[PDB]
């Protein structure tokens, strides 16, 4: 993964 | 779309994450990186386990995927078609994340799993859950990853609609 | 449950595959698309056809019916109460299938057919076979297909316990 | 009533149950005869577990219980107080049954335990939750069972309004 839009 | 077990099936906690709008325009593929499942009632089980680590350990909202692929041949609900995820950032709430749970980066995923997903994503279009003009990309060259793994994003680059 | 004439009445082949736990949350209608039969003699070898196709050319163990139903008023014995199935990938290894022999997409299938297959869910359930609280589908609504037909589909979603 | 953790903060699985008409002239204290919890992020994991075993293997709604205790001085809502449990059969429409995790039928609930249940029964009838002459009872009075076990059962058999 990789939150922030 | 056929050929999907809900989250009330497999069990699933409760939640409540800012929605996503449709159509999505980018699709992207990913590899948990992890173990992988091939009987039913052994991947109903491996669902809820990733679901539980995005809330409990990445204080994230919920399951960072809108869906998810066993090699029992089955395709499992995470967000869903309705609801953002949270693996691309600046791509999420304009994307659909569409993992296959297992480490691909040596050996591919079986027949059978691989066909569900073509299977998923040409439902996704033919319902307007993907732009017409959609965009599919390896989830490396929109994130600071390695995801999904050399031996899945080779076989994924001759697919439809893929970005290169 | 009464009326059922078994494997070894219609002569079937031997097997050994996995066995199914009770009781079954799922009850599946499904139709095989092919042939039908009216007459006793002529479903037993029609039930021998069927086993054989599964084995000899999908590379399935065993038929992937629990049970079948014959327009002669009975039902015939596929893999059994104790056996799983494989015709539903993800809901195989908690639901019981039942498909009439036969396509039924434009003419449903006998009054004699019908009330056997009513009475055999009906004593599933008495009989601890399927949940007090189990969900009647059509497996058009758990899979990739058109089964069991519109016409047989109508008529079994006025059924109890069916889902939606 | 103040103290209680709901049902969205330690992520119950999603359900629909028949529903409960109040007040109630019953009130059942059981004991779940598993393990406990001390802190709270653990308690909610236990919370989780047991709604699953409800759902899944005794193939019950949801989870069997009106309300839960942690050894932390918390309360945990089960299924709330507008719907029926299925603890006793004959008393469940017509009674709140009330649970602390763990087992005591050597070993009681700590302090901060037991307060949380007293508070939480006076502030039932207080409200008109519970009839104004309830019966405060042991799981063991109206049903096969040794619940809620013989420590737990003789502290409560002094509380008001119980019955012997």
């Given at each position: ?5 | ?9 497999w ?26 499942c091939n009987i039913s009632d052994e991947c109903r089980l491996l669902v ?22 066993g090699?029992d041949?089955a395709?499992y ?24 749970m ?63």
């Amino acid at each position: 993964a990789x939150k922030x839009x | 779309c056929p050929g999907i077990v809900p989250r009330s099936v497999w069990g699933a906690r409760e939640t409540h994450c800012p929605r996503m709008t449709l159509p999505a325009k980018y699709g992207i593929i990913i590899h948990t990186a992890g173990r992988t499942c091939n009987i039913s009632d052994e991947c109903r089980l491996l669902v809820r386990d990733i679901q539980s680590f995005y809330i409990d350990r990445l204080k994230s909202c919920d399951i960072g995927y809108n869906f998810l692929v066993g090699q029992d041949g089955a395709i499992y609900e995470g967000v869903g078609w309705n609801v953002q995820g949270s693996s691309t950032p600046g791509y999420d709430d304009i994307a659909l994340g569409i993992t296959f749970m297992g480490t691909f980066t040596g050996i591919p995923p079986n027949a059978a799993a691989l066909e569900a997903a073509q299977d998923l994503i040409q439902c996704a279009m033919v319902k307007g859950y993907l732009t017409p003009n959609y965009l599919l990309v390896g989830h490396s060259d929109v994130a600071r990853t390695l995801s999904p793994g050399q031996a899945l994003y080779n076989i994924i680059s001759t697919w439809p609609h893929f970005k290169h």
